[PDB]
Design a binder for this molecule. Structure first.
Ligand code: SF4
Ligand code: F3S
Length: 106
């Protein structure tokens, strides 16, 4: 399963959803998650993230391990997203800011 980590929060570019063959992304107010049972690990989404927020589950940074379980839990309650939309308005002010998990909205 591929995992979306911190730098997606408040950027949410959604570029990643075009390339997913199986529509494994689920949508929240300011973040996306990958559903782990649906992901076929094709890796096509992680070159497409401008915020370079997607990782293979086995490559998630040590200080971002919470995001593996977070993707699995929020994909169960968030709506599936299958079309790209505009990035959130202030997405490049927040691109690259560390510590954005405190800003996640359910
Ligand atoms: S690795 Fe593939 S199947 Fe998984 S979310 Fe990404 S594009 Fe989709
Ligand atoms: S910022 Fe997020 S919405 Fe997708 S393109 Fe990157 S994982």
């Amino acid at each position: 399963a591929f995992v979306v980590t911190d730098n997606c929060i408040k950027c949410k570019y959604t570029d990643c959803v075009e390339v997913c063959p199986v529509d494994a992304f689920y949508e929240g107010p300011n973040f996306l998650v990958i559903h782990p049972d649906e992901c076929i690990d094709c890796a096509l989404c992680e070159p497409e993230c401008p915020a370079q927020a997607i990782f293979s589950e086995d490559e998630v940074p040590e200080d971002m391990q919470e995001f593996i379980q977070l993707n699995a839990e929020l994909a169960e309650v968030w709506p599936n997203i299958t079309e790209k939309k505009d990035p959130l308005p202030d997405a490049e002010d927040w691109d690259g800011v560390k510590g954005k998990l405190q800003h996640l909205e359910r």
